[PDB]
């Protein structure tokens, strides 16, 4: 034994323990998820309010990077603001040098790259996040998952944090009942939906909903924050059904 | 230290009652070559700043890119960068004459003159000049080349002080901008007869108009204009 005492060491088993317990901080995070529709992409997640002190739509969670590529991420969150901070790099200098902005699966490898370069060393640590992201380029809209290893894939419908089995599940059913796609405005909704379900997990405290959305024809491609009345309509949507 | 090799003539301006006007010719010249006749040295930057650009265009584009980067990076964890913090042509202005007063220092000078022209968030107009000394100054008109000798003295008969500004409509502003202009197509060799305006108000916003041309030419005097003195026929 001693194995999981430094990173970047194979236990017998050929397993990094040091990423594995990356991966609880992830799932004692609060609950994120991922919608691929239509033309585009929308990211929800769980903002617990620790207290009334607490200012209302002022602690944003979710980033942008570039224009058109939204990340959300649940577990350590200035480590998932230095993963942001690197990609927004990443952005730039591929821009630069090729003028037209990242292709997302392009994007997703520049940040699978830097998070895998934390699992090869014992100098440094793995990423205590796992990150929800994606928008839409040239060739359409795409969605994907990161994880703590550097792992990656694309995804239809994404979820981590305490209350992603919860959330899975849900995105399960509409994978299954909407084979032709879903919608944009649609996407959003069943975002808010989602998070209010998956919020029994952390039924204690109460939560503030935070979305976010690329669409093609909603957007134009760019990334947006839901605010004001199509929050107010996602928010008593999602009242509604878990009633 | 380089030499500029594409380049592009004057920009004008002037501040009026409620805002600024801003123009420039479409015409980048290699030398005395009048080589290339579409190109936009007017670039706005949000709904509140254009900036102009004459000398080198390969740094201009450069400079354009720059500012292009500058209003991605101001979003970036910004709620409020479509409203209270977004960017005003105060912060546009220092940051180009930052990087040209640096980049002079390092005897490596982005070879143009920069206008910046805005209204501020208080309503204010803002209107600045910087180059690739890294020199700055403010006036109610601002013009750089040929435009400095021949616009100035025109714009500066409507706009003398800065008492004048109130009194300036956008109307009387536009028209004077229009007439520098001409004036410029007779005199600069460096010029086209297209060019791009634009005008930010307090009120109205930012207008931009593309594609404008010099017109009302006087021509018909020059057939009466024979030889170089003793000529008769």
């Known amino acids: ?243 | 230290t380089q030499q500029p090799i594409v380049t592009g003539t004057s920009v004008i301006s002037m501040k009026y009652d409620n805002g600024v006007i801003i123009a420039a010719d479409n015409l980048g010249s290699y030398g005395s070559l009048l080589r290339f006749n579409g190109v936009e040295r007017l670039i706005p930057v949000g709904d509140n700043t254009v900036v102009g650009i004459s000398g080198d265009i390969s740094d201009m584009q450069h400079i354009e890119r720059l500012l292009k980067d500058l209003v991605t990076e101001n979003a970036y964890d910004n709620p409020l960068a479509d409203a209270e913090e977004a960017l005003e042509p105060s912060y546009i202005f220092e940051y180009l004459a930052t990087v040209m007063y640096q980049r002079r220092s390092k005897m490596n000078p982005l070879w143009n003159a920069i206008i910046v022209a805005g209204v501020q968030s208080n309503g204010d107009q803002f209107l600045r000049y910087v180059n690739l000394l890294g020199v700055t100054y403010s006036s109610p008109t601002l013009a750089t080349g040929f435009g400095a000798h021949m616009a100035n003295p025109l714009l500066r008969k409507v706009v003398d002080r800065e008492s004048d500004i109130p009194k300036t409509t956008v109307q009387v502003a536009e028209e004077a901008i229009v007439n520098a202009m001409r004036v410029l197509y007779y005199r600069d060799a460096r010029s086209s007869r297209n060019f791009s305006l634009a005008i930010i108000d307090k009120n109205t916003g930012l207008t931009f108009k593309k594609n404008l041309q010099v017109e009302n030419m006087k021509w018909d005097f020059a057939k009466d204009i024979k030889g170089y003195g003793t000529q008769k026929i």
Not at chain 1, 189 to 203: C, P, R
Not at chain 1, 209 to 238: M, P
């Open chain 1, 1 to 243: 034994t001693g194995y999981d005492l430094s990173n970047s060491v194979f236990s017998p088993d050929g397993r990094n323990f040091q990423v594995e317990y990356a991966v609880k901080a992830v799932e004692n995070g609060t609950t994120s998820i991922g919608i691929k529709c239509n033309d585009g992409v929308v990211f929800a997640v769980e903002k617990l309010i620790t207290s009334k002190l607490l200012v209302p739509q002022k602690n944003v969670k979710i980033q942008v990077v570039d224009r058109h590529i939204g990340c959300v991420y649940s577990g350590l969150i200035p480590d998932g603001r230095h993963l942001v901070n690197r990609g927004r790099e990443e952005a730039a200098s591929f821009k630069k040098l090729y003028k037209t902005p990242i292709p997302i699966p392009a994007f997703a490898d520049r940040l699978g790259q830097y998070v895998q370069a934390h699992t090869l060393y014992n100098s440094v640590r793995p990423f205590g996040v796992s990150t929800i992201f994606g928008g839409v380029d040239k060739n359409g809209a795409h969605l994907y998952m990161l994880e703590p290893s550097g792992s990656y894939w694309g995804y239809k419908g994404a979820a981590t944090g305490k209350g992603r089995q919860s959330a899975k599940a849900e995105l399960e059913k509409l994978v299954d009942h909407h084979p032709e796609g879903l919608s944009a405005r649609e996407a959003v909704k069943q975002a808010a939906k989602i998070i209010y379900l998956a919020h029994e997990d952390n039924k204690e405290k109460d939560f503030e909903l935070e979305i976010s959305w690329c669409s093609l024809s909603e957007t134009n491609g760019l990334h947006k924050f839901v605010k004001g009345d199509l929050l107010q309509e996602a928010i008593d949507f999602a009242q509604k059904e878990i009633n």
